[PDB]
Amino acid sequence: MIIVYTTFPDWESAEKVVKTLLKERLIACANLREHRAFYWWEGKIEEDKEVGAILKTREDLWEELKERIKELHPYDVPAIIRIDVDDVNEDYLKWLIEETKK
Amino acid sequence: MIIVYTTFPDWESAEKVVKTLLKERLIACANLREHRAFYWWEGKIEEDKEVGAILKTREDLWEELKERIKELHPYDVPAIIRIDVDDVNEDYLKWLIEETKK
Amino acid sequence: MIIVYTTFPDWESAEKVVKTLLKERLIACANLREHRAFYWWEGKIEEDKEVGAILKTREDLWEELKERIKELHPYDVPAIIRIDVDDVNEDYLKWLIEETKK
Numbered sequence: 033m034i035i036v037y038t039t040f041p042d043w044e045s046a047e048k049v050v051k052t053l054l055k056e057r058l059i060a061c062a063n064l065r066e067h068r069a070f071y072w073w074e075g076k077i078e079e080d081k082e083v084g085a086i087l088k089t090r091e092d093l094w095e096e097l098k099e100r101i102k103e104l105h106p107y108d109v110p111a112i113i114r115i116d117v118d119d120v121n122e123d124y125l126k127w128l129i130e131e132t133k134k
Numbered sequence: 135m136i137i138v139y140t141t142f143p144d145w146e147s148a149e150k151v152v153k154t155l156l157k158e159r160l161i162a163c164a165n166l167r168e169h170r171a172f173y174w175w176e177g178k179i180e181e182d183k184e185v186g187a188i189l190k191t192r193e194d195l196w197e198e199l200k201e202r203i204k205e206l207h208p209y210d211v212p213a214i215i216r217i218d219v220d221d222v223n224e225d226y227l228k229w230l231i232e233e234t235k236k
Numbered sequence: 237m238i239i240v241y242t243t244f245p246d247w248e249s250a251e252k253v254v255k256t257l258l259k260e261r262l263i264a265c266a267n268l269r270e271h272r273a274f275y276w277w278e279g280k281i282e283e284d285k286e287v288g289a290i291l292k293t294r295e296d297l298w299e300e301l302k303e304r305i306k307e308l309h310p311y312d313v314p315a316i317i318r319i320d321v322d323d324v325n326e327d328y329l330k331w332l333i334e335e336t337k338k
């Protein structure tokens with residue numbers, strides 16, 4: 033399995049996108065929590081309050097999921113970050129496979 | 135070293151389990167923070183408020199730790215997710231080894 | 237690209253350090269959020285409220301970034317944890333490369 037991390041400008045977009053991804057059976061679950069982001073914009077350090085999203089899905093769904101996030105994301109240039117899971121308890125993995133599209 | 139991520143239904147269970155794992159010297163530390171989870175239950179998108187837990191330990195303790203989490207977890211099917219750490223500052227790694235069981 | 241995770245004792249140190257790292261062009265962005273940490277200190281389970289920081293940068297900047305965090309960190313023994321990113325959308329990766337030092 034894999035984790036995918038992305039960030040959203042607030043809760044309405046984060047929840048809309050995550051619920052669409054669940055409906056499309058591209059993810060098994062999402063964990064959403066606020067953070068404060070700091071980055072460069074035009075020679076200045078910018079802050080933005082955001083909602084980060086930790087998504088859990090199968091490896092084989094990565095490219096499809098990445099494309100759908102690109103298509104749904106409120107940001108022109110979103111972060112869509114895949115981190116592979118090195119091991120997981122089998123009962124959870126079985127559930128995640130059951131809950132994702134075939 | 136490794137990270138292990140799991141989620142709990144609230145703070146009392148999260149803290150009880152993490153403190154037991156510390157007492158058993160199976161982890162060196164835990165970072166706990168709230169999130170909102172979205173997933174499928176019986177044809178419906180369900181939300182649950184949870185406490186996520188980021189645990190830090192040695193690679194060689196993974197199987198023992200995974201079994202103990204299974205045995206302590208309030209969920210029938212918990213997420214117990216191992217992500218390997220590709221590098222870490224040595225002083226921290228030494229501390230983590232010192233603080234975990236031998 | 238890589239993620240680097242570290243923790244700070246509160247927001248002032250976290251923001252000062254992250255903004256210095258941005259100014260030095262060692263990271264492209266940071267996501268900061270509170271957590272509660274549990275760990276061993278002198279035979280007792282200790283808790284501390286902290287700010288965790290998720291940093292995003294290039295692989296080739298890891299050693300320089302790790303040294304700078306050591307030099308800036310309020311902790312004697314900070315956690316400075318590198319997790320490699322297995323894949324990312326190209327538009328984001330291009331932006332991250334553009335925003336980091338050359």
Ligand SMILES: [Cu+2]
Pocket residue numbers: 041080081082
């Ligand atoms: Cu905002």
Ligand SMILES: [Cu+2]
Pocket residue numbers: 143182183184
């Ligand atoms: Cu709940």
Ligand SMILES: [Cu+2]
Pocket residue numbers: 245284285286
């Ligand atoms: Cu504190």
